[PDB]
PDB file of C-alpha atoms in Angstrom:
ATOM      1  CA  UNK M   1      23.870  48.892  43.017  1.00 37.67           C
ATOM      2  CA  UNK M   2      26.696  47.324  40.954  1.00 40.51           C
ATOM      3  CA  UNK M   3      29.840  47.875  43.133  1.00 40.00           C
ATOM      4  CA  UNK M   4      33.209  46.375  43.733  1.00 39.14           C
ATOM      5  CA  UNK M   5      33.501  43.880  46.643  1.00 35.48           C
ATOM      6  CA  UNK M   6      36.226  43.168  49.147  1.00 35.56           C
ATOM      7  CA  UNK M   7      34.729  40.615  51.594  1.00 35.03           C
ATOM      8  CA  UNK M   8      37.310  39.095  53.968  1.00 32.77           C
ATOM      9  CA  UNK M   9      39.961  39.323  51.267  1.00 29.55           C
ATOM     10  CA  UNK M  10      37.701  37.855  48.564  1.00 29.98           C
ATOM     11  CA  UNK M  11      37.020  40.260  45.675  1.00 30.51           C
ATOM     12  CA  UNK M  12      34.201  40.505  43.116  1.00 27.14           C
ATOM     13  CA  UNK M  13      31.551  42.665  41.451  1.00 26.42           C
ATOM     14  CA  UNK M  14      27.793  42.277  41.919  1.00 26.20           C
ATOM     15  CA  UNK M  15      24.563  43.355  43.505  1.00 27.55           C
ATOM     16  CA  UNK M  16      23.826  42.418  47.155  1.00 29.06           C
ATOM     17  CA  UNK M  17      20.337  40.999  47.595  1.00 30.35           C
ATOM     18  CA  UNK M  18      18.656  39.283  50.530  1.00 30.48           C
ATOM     19  CA  UNK M  19      18.947  35.495  50.779  1.00 30.18           C
ATOM     20  CA  UNK M  20      15.640  33.677  51.386  1.00 30.88           C
ATOM     21  CA  UNK M  21      17.216  30.280  52.128  1.00 33.50           C
ATOM     22  CA  UNK M  22      18.351  28.383  55.282  1.00 31.52           C
ATOM     23  CA  UNK M  23      22.109  28.400  55.657  1.00 31.84           C
ATOM     24  CA  UNK M  24      24.740  27.150  58.126  1.00 30.05           C
ATOM     25  CA  UNK M  25      25.909  29.490  60.941  1.00 31.62           C
ATOM     26  CA  UNK M  26      29.509  28.433  60.397  1.00 32.34           C
ATOM     27  CA  UNK M  27      29.365  29.106  56.626  1.00 30.00           C
ATOM     28  CA  UNK M  28      31.796  31.696  55.337  1.00 25.51           C
ATOM     29  CA  UNK M  29      30.602  31.583  51.647  1.00 23.93           C
ATOM     30  CA  UNK M  30      29.054  29.284  49.103  1.00 23.39           C
ATOM     31  CA  UNK M  31      29.587  28.386  45.520  1.00 23.28           C
ATOM     32  CA  UNK M  32      27.446  28.113  42.282  1.00 24.94           C
ATOM     33  CA  UNK M  33      27.327  25.526  39.504  1.00 25.46           C
ATOM     34  CA  UNK M  34      30.568  27.141  38.028  1.00 26.29           C
ATOM     35  CA  UNK M  35      32.275  27.203  41.569  1.00 24.84           C
ATOM     36  CA  UNK M  36      32.374  30.975  41.938  1.00 22.74           C
ATOM     37  CA  UNK M  37      31.039  32.774  45.000  1.00 20.31           C
ATOM     38  CA  UNK M  38      27.363  33.658  44.636  1.00 17.27           C
ATOM     39  CA  UNK M  39      26.686  34.093  48.395  1.00 19.28           C
ATOM     40  CA  UNK M  40      28.812  35.157  51.334  1.00 21.40           C
ATOM     41  CA  UNK M  41      28.190  35.827  55.063  1.00 19.99           C
ATOM     42  CA  UNK M  42      28.744  39.385  56.386  1.00 21.06           C
ATOM     43  CA  UNK M  43      31.724  39.519  58.764  1.00 21.38           C
ATOM     44  CA  UNK M  44      30.539  42.072  61.402  1.00 21.58           C
ATOM     45  CA  UNK M  45      26.929  40.989  61.854  1.00 19.19           C
ATOM     46  CA  UNK M  46      25.245  37.722  60.831  1.00 17.20           C
ATOM     47  CA  UNK M  47      23.578  38.128  57.433  1.00 18.37           C
ATOM     48  CA  UNK M  48      24.155  36.309  54.154  1.00 20.33           C
TER      49      UNK M  48
ATOM     50  CA  UNK A   1     -13.310   5.331   4.046  1.00 19.09           C
ATOM     51  CA  UNK A   2     -13.393   2.677   6.758  1.00 21.43           C
ATOM     52  CA  UNK A   3      -9.691   1.833   6.319  1.00 24.08           C
ATOM     53  CA  UNK A   4      -8.329   5.342   5.958  1.00 22.97           C
ATOM     54  CA  UNK A   5     -10.216   6.990   8.866  1.00 20.35           C
ATOM     55  CA  UNK A   6      -9.107   4.330  11.270  1.00 17.66           C
ATOM     56  CA  UNK A   7      -5.550   4.629  10.119  1.00 12.99           C
ATOM     57  CA  UNK A   8      -5.258   8.322  11.152  1.00 11.22           C
ATOM     58  CA  UNK A   9      -6.533   7.488  14.654  1.00  9.87           C
ATOM     59  CA  UNK A  10      -3.904   4.829  15.139  1.00  9.79           C
ATOM     60  CA  UNK A  11      -1.248   7.607  14.666  1.00  6.02           C
ATOM     61  CA  UNK A  12      -2.930   9.839  17.403  1.00  8.03           C
ATOM     62  CA  UNK A  13      -3.100   6.902  19.885  1.00  9.85           C
ATOM     63  CA  UNK A  14       0.576   6.068  19.289  1.00 10.06           C
ATOM     64  CA  UNK A  15       1.853   9.606  19.712  1.00  9.63           C
ATOM     65  CA  UNK A  16      -0.169  10.114  22.941  1.00  7.98           C
ATOM     66  CA  UNK A  17       1.410   6.978  24.468  1.00 11.73           C
ATOM     67  CA  UNK A  18       4.840   6.262  22.988  1.00 11.04           C
ATOM     68  CA  UNK A  19       7.232   9.207  23.456  1.00  9.31           C
ATOM     69  CA  UNK A  20      10.272   7.555  21.779  1.00  9.28           C
ATOM     70  CA  UNK A  21       9.028   8.150  18.235  1.00  7.94           C
ATOM     71  CA  UNK A  22       9.779  11.881  18.659  1.00  7.47           C
ATOM     72  CA  UNK A  23      13.159  11.100  20.295  1.00  6.89           C
ATOM     73  CA  UNK A  24      15.142  11.988  17.207  1.00  6.88           C
ATOM     74  CA  UNK A  25      14.067  15.548  17.939  1.00 10.97           C
ATOM     75  CA  UNK A  26      14.846  15.027  21.565  1.00 11.35           C
ATOM     76  CA  UNK A  27      18.448  14.200  20.620  1.00  8.89           C
ATOM     77  CA  UNK A  28      18.685  17.668  19.035  1.00 10.20           C
ATOM     78  CA  UNK A  29      17.899  19.204  22.425  1.00 10.63           C
ATOM     79  CA  UNK A  30      20.000  16.794  24.536  1.00  9.79           C
ATOM     80  CA  UNK A  31      23.123  17.293  22.483  1.00  8.83           C
ATOM     81  CA  UNK A  32      22.661  21.014  22.944  1.00 11.51           C
ATOM     82  CA  UNK A  33      21.904  20.424  26.657  1.00 12.04           C
ATOM     83  CA  UNK A  34      25.369  18.832  27.076  1.00 10.23           C
ATOM     84  CA  UNK A  35      26.952  21.563  24.927  1.00 10.75           C
ATOM     85  CA  UNK A  36      25.699  24.403  27.112  1.00 12.33           C
ATOM     86  CA  UNK A  37      26.650  22.473  30.256  1.00  9.05           C
ATOM     87  CA  UNK A  38      30.131  21.836  28.826  1.00  7.72           C
ATOM     88  CA  UNK A  39      31.419  25.400  29.278  1.00  7.79           C
ATOM     89  CA  UNK A  40      29.949  25.804  32.786  1.00  7.29           C
ATOM     90  CA  UNK A  41      31.977  22.808  34.084  1.00  8.08           C
ATOM     91  CA  UNK A  42      35.199  24.089  32.490  1.00  7.64           C
ATOM     92  CA  UNK A  43      35.217  27.174  34.716  1.00  3.79           C
ATOM     93  CA  UNK A  44      35.753  25.113  37.862  1.00  2.76           C
ATOM     94  CA  UNK A  45      38.863  23.359  36.417  1.00  2.00           C
ATOM     95  CA  UNK A  46      42.215  24.683  37.700  1.00  2.00           C
ATOM     96  CA  UNK A  47      44.022  24.263  34.288  1.00  2.00           C
ATOM     97  CA  UNK A  48      47.378  23.650  36.080  1.00  2.00           C
TER      98      UNK A  48
ATOM     99  CA  UNK H   1      25.005   2.977  92.375  1.00  3.16           C
ATOM    100  CA  UNK H   2      21.762   2.581  94.272  1.00  3.38           C
ATOM    101  CA  UNK H   3      35.553   1.484  92.007  1.00  5.69           C
ATOM    102  CA  UNK H   4      34.004  -1.786  93.212  1.00  5.77           C
ATOM    103  CA  UNK H   5      30.212  -2.040  93.549  1.00  5.00           C
ATOM    104  CA  UNK H   6      29.332   0.230  90.623  1.00  3.01           C
ATOM    105  CA  UNK H   7      26.640  -1.082  88.287  1.00  2.00           C
ATOM    106  CA  UNK H   8      25.291   0.040  84.910  1.00  2.00           C
ATOM    107  CA  UNK H   9      22.346   0.001  82.454  1.00  2.00           C
ATOM    108  CA  UNK H  10      22.263  -1.085  78.833  1.00  2.00           C
ATOM    109  CA  UNK H  11      23.847   0.722  75.873  1.00  2.21           C
ATOM    110  CA  UNK H  12      25.532  -0.123  72.610  1.00  3.84           C
ATOM    111  CA  UNK H  13      28.299   1.544  70.570  1.00  3.14           C
ATOM    112  CA  UNK H  14      29.985   0.912  67.231  1.00  3.32           C
ATOM    113  CA  UNK H  15      33.518   1.468  65.875  1.00  2.00           C
ATOM    114  CA  UNK H  16      34.077   2.064  62.160  1.00  2.10           C
ATOM    115  CA  UNK H  17      37.113   2.412  59.875  1.00  2.64           C
ATOM    116  CA  UNK H  18      37.959   4.602  56.902  1.00  6.40           C
ATOM    117  CA  UNK H  19      39.262   3.917  53.400  1.00  3.13           C
ATOM    118  CA  UNK H  20      40.374   6.294  50.601  1.00  2.31           C
ATOM    119  CA  UNK H  21      37.157   6.063  48.508  1.00  4.06           C
ATOM    120  CA  UNK H  22      34.977   8.439  46.492  1.00  2.00           C
ATOM    121  CA  UNK H  23      31.381   9.344  47.216  1.00  2.00           C
ATOM    122  CA  UNK H  24      28.788  11.178  45.173  1.00  2.07           C
ATOM    123  CA  UNK H  25      26.881  13.819  47.123  1.00  3.01           C
ATOM    124  CA  UNK H  26      23.429  15.102  46.199  1.00  2.25           C
ATOM    125  CA  UNK H  27      22.564  18.629  47.445  1.00  2.00           C
ATOM    126  CA  UNK H  28      18.979  19.909  47.664  1.00  2.83           C
ATOM    127  CA  UNK H  29      17.819  23.541  47.899  1.00  3.09           C
ATOM    128  CA  UNK H  30      18.065  23.446  51.717  1.00  2.00           C
ATOM    129  CA  UNK H  31      21.623  22.037  51.933  1.00  4.51           C
ATOM    130  CA  UNK H  32      20.704  18.579  53.281  1.00  2.00           C
ATOM    131  CA  UNK H  33      22.241  15.487  51.647  1.00  3.57           C
ATOM    132  CA  UNK H  34      19.452  13.013  50.747  1.00  2.00           C
ATOM    133  CA  UNK H  35      21.566  10.409  48.832  1.00  2.71           C
ATOM    134  CA  UNK H  36      25.082   9.060  48.732  1.00  2.00           C
ATOM    135  CA  UNK H  37      26.563   6.678  46.143  1.00  5.37           C
ATOM    136  CA  UNK H  38      29.930   4.913  46.685  1.00  6.86           C
ATOM    137  CA  UNK H  39      31.539   4.322  43.274  1.00  9.76           C
ATOM    138  CA  UNK H  40      33.670   1.196  43.640  1.00 11.61           C
ATOM    139  CA  UNK H  41      31.274  -1.094  45.550  1.00 12.77           C
ATOM    140  CA  UNK H  42      28.835  -1.934  42.680  1.00 10.32           C
TER     141      UNK H  42
END
């Protein structure tokens, strides 16, 4: 669903889908080719 | 008919090997490849 | 031992330094850097 985001103070609008890649456990978020946040770790449980 | 039929087959052997004869059409794509990657890299700039 | 009579084996260690320089960093799909290019050396 297209919804508004507030993730640890960072805001955006998008659709949450499951990441198939291998990520760092200490990673808060990550950036695209345009340096905007395309992926973010969930704060309560560990999922990106 | 010996000279003309051998002359068409030298064009087909040249285009199957040398790729730089079609590179004038490849500069049409590569100037547009830098143009569409221009506006992506401007979004990461802080602009002051 | 088998501070006076203490013995030791063999090991080696290195000490480096840092300079204000610029690297290029290649990123793959898995997030592992496979190449680094220092600009001002060559």
